[PDB]
Design an enzyme around this catalytic site. Structure first.
Site, mmCIF file in Angstrom:
data_model
loop_
_atom_site.group_PDB
_atom_site.id
_atom_site.type_symbol
_atom_site.label_atom_id
_atom_site.label_comp_id
_atom_site.label_asym_id
_atom_site.label_seq_id
_atom_site.Cartn_x
_atom_site.Cartn_y
_atom_site.Cartn_z
ATOM 1 N N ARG B 60 -68.247 -34.300 -127.986
ATOM 2 C CA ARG B 60 -68.637 -35.247 -129.027
ATOM 3 C C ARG B 60 -67.511 -36.255 -129.195
ATOM 4 O O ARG B 60 -66.407 -35.892 -129.612
ATOM 5 C CB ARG B 60 -68.935 -34.528 -130.333
ATOM 6 C CG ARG B 60 -69.333 -35.452 -131.458
ATOM 7 C CD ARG B 60 -70.406 -34.817 -132.316
ATOM 8 N NE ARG B 60 -70.782 -35.677 -133.432
ATOM 9 C CZ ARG B 60 -71.094 -35.229 -134.641
ATOM 10 N NH1 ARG B 60 -71.077 -33.928 -134.891
ATOM 11 N NH2 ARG B 60 -71.423 -36.081 -135.602
ATOM 12 N N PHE B 65 -64.055 -42.764 -134.871
ATOM 13 C CA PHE B 65 -64.042 -41.640 -135.800
ATOM 14 C C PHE B 65 -63.222 -40.464 -135.288
ATOM 15 O O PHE B 65 -62.246 -40.083 -135.941
ATOM 16 C CB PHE B 65 -65.477 -41.197 -136.114
ATOM 17 C CG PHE B 65 -65.631 -40.539 -137.459
ATOM 18 C CD1 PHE B 65 -65.298 -39.209 -137.634
ATOM 19 C CD2 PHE B 65 -66.123 -41.248 -138.540
ATOM 20 C CE1 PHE B 65 -65.441 -38.597 -138.860
ATOM 21 C CE2 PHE B 65 -66.270 -40.640 -139.771
ATOM 22 C CZ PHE B 65 -65.929 -39.314 -139.930
ATOM 23 N N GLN B 68 -64.189 -34.283 -130.585
ATOM 24 C CA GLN B 68 -64.258 -32.846 -130.806
ATOM 25 C C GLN B 68 -64.395 -32.117 -129.476
ATOM 26 O O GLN B 68 -65.042 -32.605 -128.545
ATOM 27 C CB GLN B 68 -65.430 -32.494 -131.731
ATOM 28 C CG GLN B 68 -66.020 -31.105 -131.544
ATOM 29 C CD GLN B 68 -66.956 -30.719 -132.671
ATOM 30 O OE1 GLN B 68 -66.849 -31.235 -133.784
ATOM 31 N NE2 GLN B 68 -67.883 -29.813 -132.390
ATOM 32 N N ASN B 107 -64.789 -26.874 -138.543
ATOM 33 C CA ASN B 107 -65.511 -25.745 -139.105
ATOM 34 C C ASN B 107 -67.013 -26.023 -139.151
ATOM 35 O O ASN B 107 -67.492 -27.093 -138.770
ATOM 36 C CB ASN B 107 -64.956 -25.408 -140.489
ATOM 37 C CG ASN B 107 -64.992 -26.589 -141.442
ATOM 38 O OD1 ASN B 107 -65.535 -27.647 -141.124
ATOM 39 N ND2 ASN B 107 -64.402 -26.414 -142.619
ATOM 40 N N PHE B 118 -60.790 -30.691 -133.344
ATOM 41 C CA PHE B 118 -61.051 -32.106 -133.153
ATOM 42 C C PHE B 118 -59.830 -32.918 -133.546
ATOM 43 O O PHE B 118 -59.057 -32.536 -134.432
ATOM 44 C CB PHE B 118 -62.297 -32.558 -133.925
ATOM 45 C CG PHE B 118 -62.090 -32.727 -135.403
ATOM 46 C CD1 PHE B 118 -62.334 -31.678 -136.270
ATOM 47 C CD2 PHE B 118 -61.703 -33.947 -135.929
ATOM 48 C CE1 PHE B 118 -62.168 -31.833 -137.629
ATOM 49 C CE2 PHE B 118 -61.531 -34.106 -137.287
ATOM 50 C CZ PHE B 118 -61.764 -33.048 -138.137
ATOM 51 N N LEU B 127 -61.508 -36.960 -145.662
ATOM 52 C CA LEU B 127 -61.908 -35.679 -145.092
ATOM 53 C C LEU B 127 -61.159 -34.511 -145.717
ATOM 54 O O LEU B 127 -61.672 -33.386 -145.734
ATOM 55 C CB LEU B 127 -61.685 -35.699 -143.582
ATOM 56 C CG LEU B 127 -62.109 -34.454 -142.808
ATOM 57 C CD1 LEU B 127 -63.625 -34.361 -142.768
ATOM 58 C CD2 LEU B 127 -61.528 -34.476 -141.406
ATOM 59 N N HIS B 131 -60.727 -29.297 -144.849
ATOM 60 C CA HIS B 131 -60.466 -29.149 -143.424
ATOM 61 C C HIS B 131 -58.993 -28.837 -143.217
ATOM 62 O O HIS B 131 -58.134 -29.336 -143.950
ATOM 63 C CB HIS B 131 -60.860 -30.410 -142.644
ATOM 64 C CG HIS B 131 -62.262 -30.383 -142.116
ATOM 65 N ND1 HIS B 131 -62.830 -31.455 -141.462
ATOM 66 C CD2 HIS B 131 -63.204 -29.411 -142.133
ATOM 67 C CE1 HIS B 131 -64.065 -31.148 -141.107
ATOM 68 N NE2 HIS B 131 -64.317 -29.914 -141.502
#
Lengths: 48, 172, 478, 499, 130
Positions: B60, B65, B68, B107, B118, B127, B131
């Site tokens: 991904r 952004f 991952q 997660n 990631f 975020l 996390h």
């Protein structure tokens, strides 16, 4: 150990096909009931 | 930013029957404030019964952004595990997201860390709070950005496979 | 109130005209309708020429389809029928059978195949396979005084009933589990608001659909019906089936498996593979031992060649469909050429078995050459077209990871070279005391010549001129 | 210069032979002259391109050009001559012209035949002049059908079994080649990939070098006979018309060595440098195995076939044992064998077809009726004995020198392998003179009737002499085939990394 | 069956505005509305607190549905096509939802020998049109 071994191998790789073809070609052979039977067996086993 | 304990190196390969090398990433692991998670990562990146990142991918790549990866099982995100069973709870939220280049255990709902990690190619202040933070890239930022700028299909996967050939630990 | 059926409304008009002329006219029909039907076909092709480079616009109340990729196959089936009719004119002419309803059957089957290419309705995509199969047990048995043409109606009707049964049962399971839905696009929604997707059920409605699909295009484990029928029915309908049935089935399969089966990829990608790995093996070994031409063609050109088409449906990220289109375009021509040559020689002599093609190079060299060309192309040799077909099929399919399918493909192609070169060797010979008194009395010498000669150079030129074909085939999103 | 030569040199034969078709003129006569004129024109254009449009002093490519052909998988008309190619190109033109001449009295078909000859001509030159890997493969497999037709139409008693074994075997062998094509084509196709010149800088990862190396090596061992892959040769040589067999066992075999030199040693060094010693061992044992099985055969055509097999061990051992001369002595060897084997098969096929006896036991004293055949046969037997003077000696000598001064060996096998290689000189005359003595010496019945027994006329004698003279000219002063300065860059890559 | 694994982020939003029926929240409106026709969105559905049980990204092409005729959760059809007191989402828009359990499956689960949704749940969405 040249004709009897490696020539034997390079022919049996082209000879085993001549046997396997006609061997698997003589199963079933008509009799539509057999066609449908062998068509159902694979459908049933594929359900796994 | 905090103290550094271990340094882990990652290979990067693209091409899609096989991956040619393009560069090398080197990241630090804060084994001083998140020891269990850092130890999990460092152990995965080496060996210890094969549950490692050797031959993983980056499944991904969201441009601007994040990237991952770490699904050494299914390559789809629904796989991967960790040494302490299959998952374990959050460890701590001491270190915070700062800027270009951080590591976070991706997660699937709190208390469910796994193999998916990631890297943040950009700043992500929003975020935080839910996390973990356990690493920042020390060498290879340009290669990370190159991967981030890769071509993506509708599923946000990269159209050219981006695998990790070899991964290991490189001490100070 | 819609022009997206006009490519088929023209065909319906021609159908009604063909039915009317026999009711009204007396005897002026035989060479008249022979071209009047071709007028309808070429007019439908011209009508389809308009919708090139069009939108994915949805059908009447969202019923069948209208996009680019589907339009490609919609035109391809028309191409097959246009090339096939001149073959299936003179053949049935030289049998003293009624010719009107034969052309009517062929036209209606082509219509069914054309409608099938779309059909994102779950019901239209059920009637259309019947509109294509109900008009098939007739043609495949439309020589009543013969005996074999009845066996290749019994063991075709029973099989095509059982298979369509299994398919529609899978459809019913899907309609049930999907909370109630038919529209092909609108299943992955409806299979979610009803949360019964990841459950058993769907796993059954996938196999009960894939099996009914396979039977229609005959991979190995269900190939049983094909070798018989292709020998029992007249050669022109053998060619018509072996081209348009495969085209329509492969056009329906990709859409019925890619649109409503996003999630089950890893559980049908494998499945189709199990078919392909068998289809390109069991369809070749037997092909070696054959002595009849039609049955050997059934084995080789269908039992196998329906392998590498599939060989990318599994390995497809929309970067491969172009290769499937190109290989289909190559296969249609490289198959209709050899069928035209076979029809011509069989009519001119009266035999089918291989052992009578001896010496044919000396009596008439043009036909022997135009048959050897198509056969070698089927073999897939570099300068020809089949080579580049198989090549671009592998180069995109090795570029997608899967390895234990390209190797088997190349190996079985090498294996397939055998019988092609066998019949080729039987062409070139001059041992006068060996050639049977069949080619010995051959008064060598319009339609069939034209079809054979314009279908054989398309088996040599496009393999080297595939650049614009490739540039065209890349714009398919379905 | 930009006036394309190689494009003309590749598209001239097949094109100007396509006019044989659609030409109703006669049965056999006019086609022979119309084909020999085209062959001579092509050879003259070849030598004109070589003489005043080549340098011998720069290791780059010469006369190159390219176009756009399919453009999806990047595959162009890329084409260019180089040092390694030049010798084989000239040898191909020469020996194929002379083979087409040797095929003079063929009237069975005589229209498909000469056209197929020209097609094989164009295909050989296309391969030897290729510069794009996929185009190299295309030219490789293009000839596969013409040779099958030449086998199955003319030549031998059991032509069919030989032809089908040959075609199946070669087509199967080319599968691993196509595998290697697909392997290194997709490896970063944005970087040209399919331009055999711009692949010198490719740095492939481990465990992939080996797979591509083997995918090419299997196909090569299929084409160029290596011990476990040689069973096809005796059948497809003992059954072929001598006209076919000349170019077949003089050119088509050497493609398996030219390709191995061009795409393995130049592209995959650390996949070839860790696999050279086993190549050397295989060649060393082949040199003796081929001869020890040649001595056993009983029909001299298969004996000549096995003698051709044996000399293909020097080429192998020269490809391994990485030196300048070891690689360079291999080229001289492929030339001096494309001469000798071709001429020997021509002589075997010319002696036969006059006696109609294939088994070497009933051959009486043929020296009494036909002297000149006996002379030109003993001469080329001496040539094949690696006798000095003739070119069959200096090649093997340079091969020995390349093995001895090799850097990738330390004196333990560098001597035992030389020993097992020198046993070939003890072994080869034992089976060559055993044929020369049974088939020619001794006094058979009073074969006085000058019928079905006539010495070689002017054409065959001139062919023999015109192929013989180059042998002497090269063996006296070999440096007429050491115009190779690419090895000074070809063996530049390998020469320092590990081990 | 029951929940499985995933991984993503959320692009933390502002405070939700319930608007008397559901929980509405906007992130980015871009281009243009959509009539009662077939649409094509990308979702990522949560549980009330943290868990994720499906995401359109966990498959290929994000699923396609009908916005305007009742074929989906009433919550969504109210929060995508635009409900009473809520503006519809643009073509390239992006919104976030918390679905109350009356506009959802309601107080009974969907069983498959193991209910794939907790009985009487109320889930979350991060819906981005496309």
């Amino acid at each position: 150990f040249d004709k009897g071994v490696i020539d034997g191998i390079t022919n049996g790789v082209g000879l085993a096909s001549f046997c396997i073809g006609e061997e698997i070609k003589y199963v079933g052979g008509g009799r539509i009931s057999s066609y449908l039977f062998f068509f159902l067996c694979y459908v049933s086993v594929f359900l796994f | 930013q905090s103290k550094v304990t271990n340094k882990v190196y990652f290979d990067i390969n693209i091409g899609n029957p096989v991956g040619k090398n393009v560069g090398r990433i080197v990241i630090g692991l804060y084994g001083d404030d998140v020891p269990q998670t850092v130890e999990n990562f460092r152990a995965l990146c080496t060996g210890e019964k094969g549950f490692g990142y050797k031959g993983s991918s980056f499944h991904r790549v969201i441009k601007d952004f994040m990237i991952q990866g770490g699904d050494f099982d299914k390559g789809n995100g629904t796989g991967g595990k960790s040494i302490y069973g299959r998952t374990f709870k959050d460890e701590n939220f001491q270190l915070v997201h700062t800027g270009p280049g951080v590591l976070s255990m991706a997660n699937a709902g709190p208390n469910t860390n796994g193999s998916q990690f990631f890297i943040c190619t950009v700043k992500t202040p929003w975020l935080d709070g839910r996390h973990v933070v356990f690493g920042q890239v020390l060498e290879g930022m340009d290669i990370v950005r190159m991967i981030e700028s890769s071509e993506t299909d509708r599923g946000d996967r990269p159209k050219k496979k981006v695998v990790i050939s070899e991964c290991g630990e490189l001490p100070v | 109130n819609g022009s997206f059926i006009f490519p088929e409304c023209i065909l319906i008009f021609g159908l009604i005209l063909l039915l009317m002329i026999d009711s009204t006219s007396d005897q002026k029909d035989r060479p008249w309708f022979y071209f009047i039907s071709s007028t309808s076909l070429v007019i439908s092709i011209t009508a389809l020429l308009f919708r090139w480079r069009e939108e994915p616009i949805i059908s009447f109340s969202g019923n069948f389809q209208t996009n680019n990729f589907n339009e490609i196959f919609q035109f391809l089936i028309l191409l097959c029928s246009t090339l096939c009719i001149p073959l299936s004119v003179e053949y049935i002419e030289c049998t003293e059978m009624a010719i009107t309803e034969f052309l009517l059957f062929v036209l209606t089957a082509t219509l069914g195949g054309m409608f099938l290419c779309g059909a994102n309705d779950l019901i239209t995509i059920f009637v259309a396979p019947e509109c294509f199969s109900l008009c098939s047990y007739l043609l495949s048995g439309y020589t009543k005084r013969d005996l074999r043409s009845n066996e290749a109606t019994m063991k075709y009707l029973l099989m095509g009933g059982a298979s369509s049964s299994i398919l529609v049962h899978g459809f019913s399971w899907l309609y049930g589990s999907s909370g109630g839905e038919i529209e092909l696009q609108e299943i992955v929604n409806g299979l979610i608001n009803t949360q019964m997707y990841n459950s058993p059920g769907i796993s059954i409605a996938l196999i009960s659909i894939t099996v009914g699909l396979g039977f229609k295009l005959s991979p190995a484990p269900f190939h049983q019906w094909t070798p018989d029928v292709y020998e029992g029915s007249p050669t022109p309908v053998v060619a018509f089936l072996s081209v348009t049935s495969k085209v329509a089935a492969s056009a329906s399969a990709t859409r019925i498996l890619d649109i409503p089966f996003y999630f089950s990829s890893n559980e049908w990608h494998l499945l189709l593979e199990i078919l392909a790995i068998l289809s390109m093996i069991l369809g070749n070994l037997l092909a070696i031992t054959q002595t009849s031409m039609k049955r050997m063609l059934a084995y080789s050109s269908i039992g196998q060649i329906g392998y590498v088409i599939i060989g990318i449906i599994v390995g497809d990220s929309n970067d491969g469909y172009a290769s499937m289109i190109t290989y289909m375009l190559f296969y249609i021509s490289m198959n209709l050429g050899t069928f035209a040559c076979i029809v011509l020689f069989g009519l001119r002599t009266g035999t089918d078995n291989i052992r009578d093609y001896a010496g044919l190079y000396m009596k008439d060299p043009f036909l022997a050459l135009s048959l050897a060309l198509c056969l070698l192309s089927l073999g897939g040799l570099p300068p020809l077209a089949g080579f580049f077909g198989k090549l671009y099929l592998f180069w995109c399919g090795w570029q997608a990871g899967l390895y234990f399918l390209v190797s088997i493909g190349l190996l079985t192609s090498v294996l397939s070279i055998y019988y092609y070169l066998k019949i080729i060797k039987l062409l070139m010979t001059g041992r006068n005391q060996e050639i049977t008194p069949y080619v010995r009395n051959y008064r060598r010498s319009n339609s069939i010549e034209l079809s054979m000669t314009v279908c054989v150079i398309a088996s040599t030129i496009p393999g080297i001129s595939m650049n614009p074909i490739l540039a065209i085939a890349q714009d398919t999103l379905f | 210069s930009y006036f394309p030569w190689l494009t003309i040199l590749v598209v001239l034969p097949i094109f100007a032979g396509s006019l044989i078709f659609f030409l109703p003129h006669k049965g056999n006569k006019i086609v022979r002259w119309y084909t020999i004129s085209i062959c001579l024109l092509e050879f003259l254009l070849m030598t004109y391109a070589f003489c005043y449009h080549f340098q011998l002093e720069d290791p780059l490519i010469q006369l190159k050009e390219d176009y756009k052909w399919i453009d999806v998988f990047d595959f162009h008309w890329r084409l260019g001559i180089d040092g390694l190619s030049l010798g084989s190109i000239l040898l191909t033109g020469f020996i194929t012209t002379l083979a087409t001449l040797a095929a003079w009295p063929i009237t069975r078909n005589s229209r498909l035949f000469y056209f197929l000859m020209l097609a094989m001509y164009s295909g050989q030159i296309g391969l030897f002049s290729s510069r794009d890997l996929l185009l190299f493969f295309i030219m490789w497999e293009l000839e596969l059908i013409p040779v099958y037709l030449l086998l199955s139409m003319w030549g031998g008693k059991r032509r069919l079994y030989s032809a089908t074994k040959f075609i199946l075997y070669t087509a199967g062998g080319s599968i691993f080649f196509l595998i290697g094509v697909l392997g290194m084509g997709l490896y970063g196709s944005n970087e040209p990939g399919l331009d055999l010149e711009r692949l010198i800088n490719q740095s492939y990862p481990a465990t992939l070098e080996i797979l591509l190396y083997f995918g090419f090596l299997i196909a090569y061992a299929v084409k160029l006979p290596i011990i476990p892959l040689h069973t096809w040769l005796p059948d497809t040589h003992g059954e072929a018309h001598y006209s076919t067999c000349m170019l077949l066992a003089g050119i088509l075999l050497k493609m398996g060595a030219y390709g191995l030199i061009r795409i393995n040693m130049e592209l995959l060094p650390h996949a070839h440098y860790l696999f050279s010693p086993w190549l050397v061992i295989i060649g060393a044992i082949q040199i003796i195995y081929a001869a020890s099985t040649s001595l056993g055969q009983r029909n001299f055509k298969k004996r000549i076939a096995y003698s051709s097999v044996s000399h293909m061990g020097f080429i192998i051992i020269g490809i391994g044992s990485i030196t300048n001369i070891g690689l360079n002595g291999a080229i001289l060897q492929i030339l001096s064998h494309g001469f000798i084997g071709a001429t020997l098969f021509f002589l075997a096929g010319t002696a036969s077809d006059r006696m109609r006896l294939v088994y070497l036991e009933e051959l009486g004293g043929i020296s009494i009726p036909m002297p000149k055949i006996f002379t030109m046969f003993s001469s080329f037997s001496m040539a094949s004995l690696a006798l000095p003077g003739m070119s069959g000696f200096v090649a093997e000598l340079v091969v020995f020198f390349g093995l001895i001064t090799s850097p990738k060996f330390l004196l333990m096998p560098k001597a035992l392998i030389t020993f097992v290689m020198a046993i070939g000189m003890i072994l080869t005359p034992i089976y060559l003179l055993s044929m020369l003595r049974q088939m020619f010496y001794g006094y058979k019945l009073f074969n006085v009737p000058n019928a079905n027994f006539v010495d070689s006329g002017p054409r065959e004698l001139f062919i023999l002499i015109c192929i013989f003279l180059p042998v002497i000219g090269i063996g006296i002063y070999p440096d007429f085939v050491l115009s190779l300065s690419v090895d000074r860059v070809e063996a530049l890559l390998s020469n320092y990394y590990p081990k | 069956a029951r929940a499985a694994l995933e991984l993503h982020r959320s692009l933390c939003p502002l405070l939700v505005s319930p608007r008397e029926l559901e929980f509405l929240q906007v992130r980015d409106p871009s281009f243009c509305s959509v009539s009662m026709v077939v649409t094509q969105i990308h979702y990522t559905a949560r549980f009330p607190d943290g868990t994720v049980f499906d995401s359109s990204y966990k498959r290929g092409r994000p699923l396609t549905m009908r916005i305007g005729a009742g074929k989906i959760l009433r919550g969504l059809q109210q929060g995508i096509g635009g409900g009473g007191g809520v503006t519809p989402m643009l073509v390239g828009g992006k919104r976030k939802l918390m679905i109350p359990p009356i506009l959802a499956y309601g107080p009974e689960p969907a069983g498959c020998f193991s209910e794939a949704v907790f009985a009487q749940a109320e889930m979350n969405f991060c819906a981005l049109a496309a």
